A paper describes a structure:
The six subunits NqrA, B, C, D, E, and F of Na+-NQR harbor a unique set of cofactors that shuttle the electrons from NADH twice across the membrane to quinone. Here we show that ion pumping in Na+-NQR is driven by large conformational changes coupling electron transfer to ion translocation.
The bound NADH is clearly visible in the map, and the nicotinamide is Π-stacked parallel to the isoalloxazine of the FAD for efficient hydride transfer. Structural information on reduced Na+-NQR was obtained by a cryo-EM sample with a fivefold excess of NADH over UQ-2, which presumably results in the reduction of most redox cofactors. Minor changes are observed for NqrF, which exhibits less flexibility and in which the ferredoxin-like domain moved 2 Å closer to the FNR-like domain of NqrF than in the oxidized state. In the cryo-EM structures, FMNNqrC resides in close proximity to FMNNqrB at a distance of 5.7 Å, compatible with very fast electron transfer. In the cryo-EM structure, FMNNqrC resides at a distance of 27.3 Å from [2Fe-2S]NqrD-E.
Author numbering:
A (entry chain A): -1 to 446
B (entry chain B): 20 to 414
C (entry chain E): 2 to 198
D (entry chain D): 7 to 208
E (entry chain C): 7 to 257
F (entry chain F): 2 to 406
The structure:
């Protein structure tokens, strides 16, 4: 198909790559829905501790987004409703038990492409799969009444230690095709299936268009795909969904039941046997990674190391948009003149370290910042990792200074926190640009 | 004892890397940091510093032996502590003086200036950090070394202290410190000295550390007469292009040798610390303007016939292009802006060298002008990018 | 040629804002935004180009000693003549723009009330009188001085916009840091001092 | 009335808080004598213009208010220039075009329009005197520092023996150039707002 | 009410113009006197006559200083109003001035006035010296000076630079009392009657007759002074007048 | 002499400048009347020469807009959707109009200056704002420093009001003395404790002020209101008293007073969520209006709570009415707290700050505070404290209705 090659980026050579073979996985007894992963989500609860819930049953609604329902991935008893500072809903936890579930309408594989948009929207909202969609700009769940003319299906995963989408999709090719047909019916415009060169199941609808993206990590991001195919703005909003959610949509519209099975790459430098494992949405990571990690102080992350949630405490559960569990060591050690020693076993975008001389090396990366917090000195690292047609240095300076208008002018509305992960990685000042971008976007949305 | 917390933290972080871990997304971070960047830049000027000390000592000894001999030379040596200390530490001041004695004299002339600038600038930085409750940034090492390497060997210590005070406080600290200013601090201090005490940073009695010696430098000699006027009065030999390239000429400590500066610049550019685009723009501008002046010609201004390679090897052009024009904070933040910034620096430097009789060299003034005008270059580039975005990138 | 040299000197070598500190009030007040600075610079350019030649003609015809009549010199009316002429020109331009060219008035006519009695125009006219210029020389000098003022204000606006990331101590934030920035800009512009173009 | 007339000195400075009368402050401050004469001229011109505008404030047509005020200011400045040429010829020559530029000085016109137009003659005169006093305070401070540190002299009287005259002090040439006035005014504003935080900008 | 506006504006303009014109016309004479006395004080200072106060300056200048006009091309005295003469304006005017070629223009002055003004210091029915105004381009501006020459026309009694804009300390040393006093006793011309005054870098030999110590670190200003003197002692300058004076032109 | 020539030239130059300026004005400046269109209605159009402010022009025309701060760009309640014309948006206007509202076209009437043709759309509700001359009925003191005043419209186009709204009243120049104030013995003892009657007011300029209402919609042709005397602060008694407050306290029965039309958007949402009311002092008026509207006109079954904060027992009013309402309907529960009760009060119930006592008593054990609509009205400090407490309880701004102004 149409191929776009990315030259600027960074593929992190972190040790402990997955085996790319699907395993049965452990048994999960607790499944949680995280309330802080949904942008601008103020929850109105519909269940209480000890309540019995079925699969695909509403647990809470969104005050700011009326009609959006967040349903239970599993059937069982609500055990905890974790609320943090200012009573922010950290997570709703359910102990798994039973087979009771909610069911919906089902159609043949030859009818989905012709299904009514209103019916598709109603079924998705009722089942809770609607939350799979994310709107760019602002990376929020789309409004029920809203519609978009560009739906981006991320069929490729370039995140470090990420599962190969082809292996997962080959098992559920029929479900993927059904989901593509449903998305083609739902979209007012086109469905851009963004993938690597390797072949995938193909939909026959003229709306669905396959686009091949090549290059380092940023090539696999829906933000990059949107920038290169359907540039987004306040007047042009695109939707984003991943291949697993497309398979779930196809299964829902084919069988009438919510599909909560996921394939997640459990991989990291401190993982004995990194590989892909079957699990359930919101699965407890303390149980998923049980008896599989080397001894010592480690951090479990839902999502990639570049962009993920530290799976600890109430947040120790798989995220809604995460298909990966990364276990890393905690780099709290202090060494004498560490900043001056030759860079053997040290990774860097710059060539200031000896490590870059040894090609093919894999680094047992830790969670250390490799330096203190300093002011931003633009030595040119951001341009090496930003492929989008933007001025990363000036955009990041605007984000640091909190100039929302200038940031929007410079293209902050086309970006998600995952888009600035590599900028955060390569910053010598140790800025966390994802938080700055989120604050700027929140201010822009509140003002507009 | 919280008052000295900033100093204690600076010392502790210098000795040991902090054990801090990431708190949010991007749980892994790049190994490079400001400490390593600044230390790499600081080490990249070590060959230039050492050759500068050697050349200062050699030129001073040659001038002393050319002016005085015998008991008069002994009296001069006894009259100058820079000389009798070198003699005390085993360094002969005679004509048959070795590289060790020349380096020792260069050290006696350079280390006091470096220590003074470092102490004063560090005091100002520490005062600002303690009063404003901040941590100490790492760029002061580079600022101090670069300031110390671009001044005549015979600069008064109080003048050096005033210059570093101006460059640090007025150009950087009042703007928030490292990474928060628009001007080059070292060049700002040097310009303060330039425009406040010209007699000590210009003329014929400051570029050679010999008592009673008056000798013009290569740029001044070329201005007076032309290429044929390049003669080293101390040795009575013509100044060859090879001599100027290797650094066997009078001038500032760190500017003389283009070869050592090229080595250091190559290292830092390979490591990616210094922008090669700025260097390319500077070279393009210098070559273009020099060739234009050569083609136009002039029967009165000998400088009009200076070739681009002579421009490269003369003055502080190489030092400025490699270490002063590549300051990331004072340069443009876009690639096209960097190209324009370098071209402007080169053009302005050649223009000040040629059509400005007051100042033999203009690299510092050119870099200051380019620092002033770089934000406009990046603004133009950003406006073009914004127009493209509003056009949806042609979609 | 002579006119090219005069234009270059009046743009770079003879910079009103930094060399002569002319118009520094509006210079430091309107330099917050680059677009506003560009508009103000264009307004200053047009006002100077339309004022300096008219002032030159008036001076040659009347205020010059003995020009109007033998044994009579009216050089003591220089200041009022020039300032009144400038005030009339600025107001009539601002009104004709507001009437016939709404977009031109919006782009540039907004700043004209601030240029009505600006120090830059009066200083340029005073220097022109203190020197010896013809009509074409006065036109070129006015255009060049306006261009130099525009360059200075635009550079200051760019620097100030870049300083959004800076952390200026309180008390120095605003007017004081603008003054320090202007001083550094003057240092940078001193590079052309030795040129005798 | 003492507080009212002294308020412009520090509380509401025409150069430290208001951006007015900066050209003369930056240029004339090379010598303390020139700064003093400029201060006196500005005080006199501002006071007289305010007094006359207040005298005929009611009868001034609005359509030509700017021209009517500028005519009075220009006439006063012309008289002052002729006086400074007749006496203090050297000071007049040193001042050069800035004596004439006093007309376009922002302080005079701003005070005339804001205060003298809607105030009684004596209060307008006092307001002009106070504004000129504050402008002169700033000018005197800057000029004192510049002259002292650039020539070792105050009002032409040697205070620091220069090396060129067998002394011990080397004058700071930068104090006779443009950047010195800018830096001095910036740091003066810094000190003023440090001792009066209420004037700190946001 | 246009009539009221016209009445008020014309009345205000009338009163303002009345007072302005009265002040200007009344002070015209005082201003002219001030400028004249400013020139006279410097002329007397270079002549070597001590004068303090305006009255003393005027009296001494009238008693001793005698202005005269000299034509450069011929070197003979020319009748005219020497006292109220402006050589700068005359040079600026093309009709009364002459353009100089590149070879001729050693001092980098575009125009040369056809008629210059000199000052004879009368000791009483006798001239003791002649003061010549010279000027030449410096590094930053044009420097003007008065050179006092004995009646023999080959000795410098004193020199003073009354208008310059060079950098203080480096180029302003032309106004240094020691540097100016060093000029006394120098010979403008050698035995061959040619420009012999020289500014020598790194000082001058002790007992030298035509050598003057240069300005330390100010070679450009020293070169400007050298060019000024070389031009103004040549044929295009006061060369012919000095040659005439050497043979009793003044006496 | 040259004096005559100089004078002639000066006069000629000045006259030429003046004539040129006058001719330019005559031939360029348009003196035609400016037309303002309201909702594109020819009948509802205004014609006025350039100058002044749009708020003044509209007031002269007859349509009234909220002017709580009386100009100066402080309240921001004056908002008009100018579809075209009116110029750009001023920085002072931007302080209360967001970017989205500005894009929609909202502008401040008191800040926008009318100079050329402008078209603006105004909601029909504005046409319901009218100016009346009400008659006083009762001015009996209701507390130590809080009084109840009942102004009745003279049956002239009495536009129905909405619960929670406020009116605007203008008091011209006048002079009043605290002696004329009516104070029964119970409150007069406290008043004379510090001889507060020594104060007097002399207003030399008409003053316009906005005051909340206290009558539920079921009340026809009646405007009840509560007024708190703005006595000088105890720390600085030398300062003058409150102009409008003293004037209102100095009114007499039967006197005619000018009032404006309905204003404000402090209305209750048409939902079934629980309502919590936080009133204090003068806030009792709007809180009572809301409660009576919800319990009499609508008779809603929603759970309702009313927490009122009084400085002392003597400052408590409508206690009998609220107790009767609570007895009639258990869905409404009231709990008053005394922040600074006097020794004579002998209060045995809730004390302390209203927000703190409410948080400790009810919201602490509440399961879903975020689902409760919190209406509040009181002093600015009380409003800030309650808002901070609710935010700490994770209550969004949508469910919190307050008269920010
Ligand atoms: C929509 C709305 C509704 C309102 N509803 C009500 C309501 O229902 N009931 C109610 O009582 N109010 C209400 N108000 C408030 C009312 O509008 C007045 O602001 C308030 O009553 C004070 O009026 P005043 O005449 O005392 O004001 P002002 O004259 O502005 O202020 C007088 C007060 O200020 C003090 N003061 C002034 N200067 C100083 C100084 N330098 N130092 C110390 N003290 C000083 C005086 O001593 C006195 O206490 C409402 C306001 C709005 C906007
Ligand atoms: C102001 C107070 C004093 C401080 C000012 C500096 C002077 C004092 C400190 C100087 C340091 C060196 C100490 C003395 C070394 C003496 C070595 C010796 O044996 O004598 C000289 C010898 C060369 O001898 P030779 O040339 O054979 O001649 C002999 C007889 N003709 O020498 C050699 O063989 C070569 C030795 C060269 C040593 C001098 C050069 C040092 C440069 C490095 C300094 C860098 C520091 C700054 C950079 C950052 C540091 C963190
Ligand atoms: N916008 C509107 O429609 C209305 C606004 N108001 C405002 O309410 C004000 C009430 O004034 P008064 O009757 O004199 O009030 P008041 O003196 O009677 O006090 C009322 C309440 O405020 C509380 N309070 C005061 N300061 C507090 C603080 N720092 N923290 C917490 N609680 C605090 C007291 O404890 C008391 O419960 C009016 O002056 C006006 O500003 C009143 C009525 C209507
Ligand atoms: Na060299
Ligand atoms: Na030069």
């Amino acid at each position: 198909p149409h191929m776009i090659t990315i030259k600027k980026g960074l593929d992190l050579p972190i040790a402990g790559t997955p085996s790319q073979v699907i395993s049965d996985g452990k048994a999960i007894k607790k499944v949680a829905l995280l309330g802080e992963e949904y942008v601008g989500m103020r929850p109105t609860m519909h269940v209480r501790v000890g309540d019995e819930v079925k699969k695909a049953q509403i647990l809470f609604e969104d005050k700011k987004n009326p009609g959006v329902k967040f349903t239970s991935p599993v059937s069982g008893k609500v055990v905890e409703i974790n609320r943090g500072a200012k009573r922010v809903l950290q997570s709703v936890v359910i102990e798994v038990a039973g087979d009771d579930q909610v069911t919906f309408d089902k159609f043949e594989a030859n009818q989905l492409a012709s299904l009514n948009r209103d019916a598709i929207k109603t079924q998705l909202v009722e089942s809770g799969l609607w939350t799979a969609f994310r709107t760019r700009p602002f990376s929020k769940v789309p409004a029920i009444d809203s519609t978009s003319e560009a739906i981006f299906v991320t069929a490729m995963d370039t995140n470090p230690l990420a599962a190969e989408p082809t292996v997962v999709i080959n098992e559920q090719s029929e479900a993927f095709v059904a989901g593509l047909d449903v998305l083609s019916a739902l979209t007012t415009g086109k469905v851009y299936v963004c993938k690597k060169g390797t072949s995938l199941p193909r939909s026959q609808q003229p709306n669905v268009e396959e686009h091949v993206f090549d290059g380092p990590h940023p090539a696999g991001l829906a933000g990059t795909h949107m920038h290169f195919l359907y540039p987004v703005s306040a007047d042009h909003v695109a939707w984003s969904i991943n291949y697993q959610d497309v398979i779930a949509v196809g299964q829902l519209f084919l069988t009438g039941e919510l599909y909560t099975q996921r394939v997640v790459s459990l991989a990291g430098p401190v993982v004995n046997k990194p590989r892909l494992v079957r699990t359930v949405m919101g699965a407890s990571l303390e149980q998923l990674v049980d008896s599989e990690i080397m001894p010592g102080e480690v951090r479990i992350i839902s999502g990639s190391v570049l962009s993920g949630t530290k799976a600890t405490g109430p947040h120790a559960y798989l995220g809604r948009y995460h298909l990966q569990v990364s276990v890393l060591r905690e780099g709290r050690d202090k060494e004498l003149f560490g900043w001056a020693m030759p860079g053997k076993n040290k990774f860097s975008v710059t060539r200031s370290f000896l490590g870059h001389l040894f090609k093919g090396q894999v680094y047992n990366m830790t969670t250390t910042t490799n330096g203190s917090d300093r002011s931003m000195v633009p030595i040119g690292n951001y341009e090496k990792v930003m492929p989008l047609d933007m001025e990363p240095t000036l955009l990041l300076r605007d984000l640091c200074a909190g100039d929302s208008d200038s940031a929007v002018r410079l293209g902050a509305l086309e970006l998600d926190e995952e888009d600035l992960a590599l900028c955060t990685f390569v910053c010598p000042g140790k800025y966390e640009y994802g938080q700055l971008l989120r604050e700027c976007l929140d201010k822009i949305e509140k003002e507009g | 004892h919280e008052k000295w917390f900033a100093l204690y933290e600076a010392a502790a972080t210098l000795f040991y890397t902090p054990g801090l871990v990431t708190k949010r997304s991007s749980h892994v971070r790049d190994s490079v940091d400001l400490k390593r960047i600044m230390i790499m830049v600081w080490l990249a000027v070590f060959p230039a510093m050492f050759w500068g000390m050697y050349n200062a000592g050699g030129q001073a000894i040659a001038a002393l032996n050319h002016l005085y001999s015998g008991d008069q030379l002994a009296a001069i040596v006894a009259g100058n502590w820079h000389y009798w200390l070198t003699e005390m530490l085993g360094g002969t001041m005679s004509s048959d003086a070795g590289w060790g004695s020349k380096m020792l004299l260069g050290a006696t002339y350079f280390l006091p200036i470096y220590a003074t600038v470092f102490i004063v600038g560090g005091f100002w930085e520490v005062l600002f950090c303690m009063v404003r409750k901040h941590e100490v940034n790492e760029g002061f090492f580079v600022t101090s070394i670069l300031f110390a390497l671009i001044v005549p060997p015979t600069l008064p210590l109080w003048q050096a202290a005033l210059g570093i005070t101006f460059g640090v406080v007025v150009a950087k600290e009042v703007f928030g410190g490292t990474g928060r200013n628009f001007l080059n601090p070292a060049l700002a201090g040097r310009a303060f000295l330039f425009f406040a005490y010209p007699a000590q940073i210009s003329g014929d009695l400051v570029w050679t550390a010999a008592d009673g010696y008056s000798g013009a430098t290569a740029l001044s000699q070329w201005a007076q007469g032309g290429a044929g006027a390049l003669i080293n009065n101390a040795t009575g030999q013509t100044i060859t292009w090879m001599d100027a390239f290797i650094g066997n000429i009078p001038g500032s400590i760190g500017e003389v040798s283009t070869l050592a500066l090229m080595i250091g610049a190559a290292f830092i550019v390979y490591m990616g610390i210094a922008s090669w685009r700025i260097i390319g723009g500077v070279m393009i501008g210098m070559i273009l303007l020099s060739t234009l002046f050569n083609v136009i010609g002039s029967d009165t201004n000998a400088m009009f016939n200076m070739p681009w390679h002579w421009h490269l090897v003369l003055g502080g052009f190489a030092f400025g292009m490699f270490f002063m024009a590549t300051d990331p904070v004072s340069a443009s933040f876009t690639n096209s802006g960097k190209w324009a910034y370098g071209i402007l620096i080169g053009v302005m430097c050649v223009l000040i060298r040629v059509v400005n009789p007051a100042y033999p060299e203009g690299m510092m003034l050119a870099i200051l002008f380019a620092n002033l005008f770089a934000p406009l270059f990046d603004h133009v580039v950003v406006e073009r990018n914004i127009k493209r975005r509003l056009a949806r990138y042609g979609k | 040629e002579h006119y090219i040299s005069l234009l270059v000197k009046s743009i770079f070598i003879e910079n009103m804002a930094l060399s002569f500190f002319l118009g520094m009030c509006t210079f430091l007040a309107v330099s917050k935004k680059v677009k506003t600075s560009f508009g103000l610079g264009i307004a200053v350019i047009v006002v100077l180009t339309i004022s300096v030649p008219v002032n030159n003609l008036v001076y040659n015809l009347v205020l010059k000693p003995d020009a109007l009549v033998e044994g009579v010199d009216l050089s003591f009316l220089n200041f009022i003549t020039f300032i009144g002429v400038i005030a009339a020109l600025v107001q009539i331009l601002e009104m004709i723009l507001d009437r016939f060219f709404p977009p031109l008035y919006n782009a540039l006519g907004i700043f004209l009330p601030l240029i009505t009695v600006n120090c830059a125009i009066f200083g340029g006219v005073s220097f022109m009188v203190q020197r010896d210029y013809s009509f074409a020389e006065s036109v070129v000098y006015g255009f060049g001085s306006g261009v130099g003022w525009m360059l200075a204000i635009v550079a200051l606006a760019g620097i100030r916009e870049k300083m959004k990331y800076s952390d200026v101590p309180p008390g120095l934030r605003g007017l004081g840091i603008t003054f320090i920035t202007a001083g550094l800009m003057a240092l940078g512009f001193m590079s052309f001092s030795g040129v005798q173009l | 009335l003492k507080k009212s007339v002294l308020a412009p000195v520090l509380d509401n400075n025409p150069i430290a808080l208001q951006v007015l009368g900066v050209c003369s402050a930056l240029a004339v401050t090379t010598k303390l004598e020139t700064a003093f004469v400029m201060t006196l001229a500005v005080m006199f011109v501002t006071a007289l213009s305010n007094f006359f505008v207040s005298l005929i404030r009611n009868h001034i047509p609005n359509s030509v208010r700017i021209i009517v005020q500028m005519a009075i200011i220009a006439s006063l400045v012309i008289v002052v220039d002729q006086i400074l040429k007749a006496y203090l010829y050297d000071i007049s020559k040193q001042l050069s075009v800035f004596v004439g530029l006093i007309i376009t000085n922002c302080i005079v016109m701003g005070r005339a329009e804001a205060f003298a137009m809607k105030s009684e003659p004596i209060p307008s005169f006092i307001d002009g005197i106070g504004n000129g006093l504050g402008y002169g305070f700033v000018l005197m401070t800057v000029g004192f520092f510049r002259e002292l540190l650039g020539s070792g002299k105050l009002f032409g009287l040697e205070v620091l023996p220069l090396i060129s005259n067998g002394g011990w002090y080397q004058p700071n040439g930068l104090m006779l150039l443009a950047p010195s006035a800018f830096f001095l005014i910036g740091f003066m504003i810094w000190a003023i707002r440090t001792f009066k935080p209420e004037q700190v900008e946001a | 009410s246009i009539k009221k506006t016209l009445f008020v504006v014309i009345a205000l303009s009338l009163v303002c113009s009345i007072i302005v014109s009265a002040a200007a016309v009344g002070l015209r004479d005082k201003q002219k006197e001030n400028a004249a006395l400013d020139k006279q004080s410097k002329i007397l200072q270079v002549a070597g006559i001590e004068a303090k106060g305006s009255k003393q300056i005027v009296e001494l200048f009238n008693k001793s200083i005698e202005p005269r006009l000299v034509d450069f091309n011929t070197g003979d005295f020319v009748e005219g109003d020497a006292a109220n003469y402006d050589q700068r304006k005359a040079a600026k005017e093309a009709s009364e001035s002459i353009k100089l070629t590149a070879e001729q223009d050693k001092a980098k002055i575009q125009r040369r006035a056809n008629v210059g003004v000199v000052y004879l210091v009368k000791d009483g029915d006798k001239t003791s010296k002649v003061i010549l105004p010279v000027h030449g381009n410096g590094l930053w501006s044009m420097m003007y000076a008065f050179v006092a020459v004995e009646t023999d026309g080959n000795t410098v009694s004193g020199l003073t630079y009354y208008e310059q804009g060079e950098t203080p300390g480096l180029g302003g040393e032309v106004e240094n009392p020691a540097w100016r006093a060093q000029w006394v006793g120098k010979k403008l011309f050698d035995e061959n009657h040619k420009p012999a005054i020289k500014i020598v870098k790194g000082g001058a030999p002790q007992g030298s007759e035509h050598g003057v110590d240069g300005l330390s670190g100010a070679t450009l200003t020293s070169n400007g002074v050298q060019n000024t003197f070389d031009f103004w002692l040549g044929d295009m300058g006061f060369g012919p007048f000095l040659t005439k004076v050497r043979d009793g032109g003044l006496n | 002499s040259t004096i005559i020539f100089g004078v002639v030239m000066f006069t000629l130059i000045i006259l030429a400048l003046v004539l040129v300026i006058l001719f330019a004005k005559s031939k360029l400046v348009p003196t035609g009347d400016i037309t303002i269109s309201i909702n594109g209605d020819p009948e509802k159009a205004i014609v006025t020469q350039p100058g002044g402010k749009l708020l003044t022009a509209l007031a002269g025309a007859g349509v009234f807009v909220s002017s709580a701060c009386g100009g100066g760009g402080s309240c921001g309640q004056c908002r008009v959707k100018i579809k075209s014309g009116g110029g750009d948006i001023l920085p002072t206007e931007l302080d209360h109009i967001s970017k989205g509202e500005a894009r929609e076209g909202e502008r401040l009437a008191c800040q926008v200056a009318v100079k050329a043709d402008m078209d603006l759309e105004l909601p029909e509700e504005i046409f319901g704002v009218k100016k009346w001359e009400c008659t006083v009925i009762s001015n009996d003191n209701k507390a130590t420093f809080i009084k109840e005043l009942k102004l009745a419209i003279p049956d002239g186009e009495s536009v129905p009001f909405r619960a929670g709204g406020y009116i605007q009243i203008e008091a011209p120049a006048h002079h009043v003395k605290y002696a004329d104030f009516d104070v029964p013995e119970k409150y007069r003892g406290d008043w004379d404790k510090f001889n507060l009657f020594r104060y007097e007011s002399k207003v030399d300029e008409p003053i316009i002020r906005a005051y909340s209402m206290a009558n539920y919609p079921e009340e026809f042709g009646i405007i009840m209101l509560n007024v708190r005397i703005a006595t000088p602060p105890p720390n600085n008694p030398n300062v003058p008293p409150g102009q409008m407050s003293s004037y209102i306290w100095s009114l007499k029965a039967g006197d005619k007073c000018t009032i404006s039309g309905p204003f404000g958007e402090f209305f209750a949402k048409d939902t079934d969520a629980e309502m919590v009311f936080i009133g204090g002092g003068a806030g009792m008026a709007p809180m009572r209006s809301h409660i009576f509207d919800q319990l009499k006109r609508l008779k809603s079954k929603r759970k309702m709570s009313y927490w009122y904060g009084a400085r002392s027992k003597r400052e408590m009013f409508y206690v009998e009415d609220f107790d009767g309402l609570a007895a009639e309907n258990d869905n409404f529960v009231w709990h008053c707290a005394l922040s600074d009760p006097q020794p004579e009060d002998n209060w045995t119930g809730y004390t302390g700050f209203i927000h703190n006592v409410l948080y400790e008593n009810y919201l602490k054990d509440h399961e879903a505070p975020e689902d409760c609509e919190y209406y509040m009205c009181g002093p600015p400090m009380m409003n800030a404290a309650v808002i901070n407490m609710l935010k700490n309880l994770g209550v969004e701004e949508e469910n919190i209705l307050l008269d920010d102004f």
